[PDB]
């Protein structure tokens, strides 16, 4: 069901607009190297909290 945005457990602290990639245990962590980027967060989240961001 093609989702435009997901809710993924943050593997660290994530700021709004941060590009995200996979982390430990499949968690979402901040990145900076295009290729690892699968989505951009739309809200701030602390480690262990869900963060919702658009795919793209």
């Amino acid at each position: 069901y093609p989702l435009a945005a997901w809710q993924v457990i943050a593997g660290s602290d994530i700021k709004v607009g941060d590009n995200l990639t996979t982390g430990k245990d499949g968690t979402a962590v901040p990145t900076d190297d295009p290729s690892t980027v699968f989505g951009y967060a739309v809200e701030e989240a602390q480690e262990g909290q869900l963060v919702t961001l658009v795919i793209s």
């Binding site: 809710q7 457990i9 262990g48 909290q49 869900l50």
Partner: protein, 50 residues
């Protein structure tokens, strides 16, 4: 004096919604902010303003 959440007993199906609201007894007649916070839950369950 006292804050009153109006749906006191609520029952929500898993993956559902519920609209809570709060009455605030205050003698001072000052505007007061109501800070909505859900507890006892897991990763996923969240509440907004109102």
């Amino acid at each position: 004096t006292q804050v009153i959440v109006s749906p006191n007993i609520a029952a929500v199906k898993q993956g559902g919604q519920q609209q809570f609201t709060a009455y605030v007894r205050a003698t001072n007649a000052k505007d007061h902010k109501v800070v909505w916070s859900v507890e006892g839950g897991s990763t996923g369950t969240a509440i907004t303003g109102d």
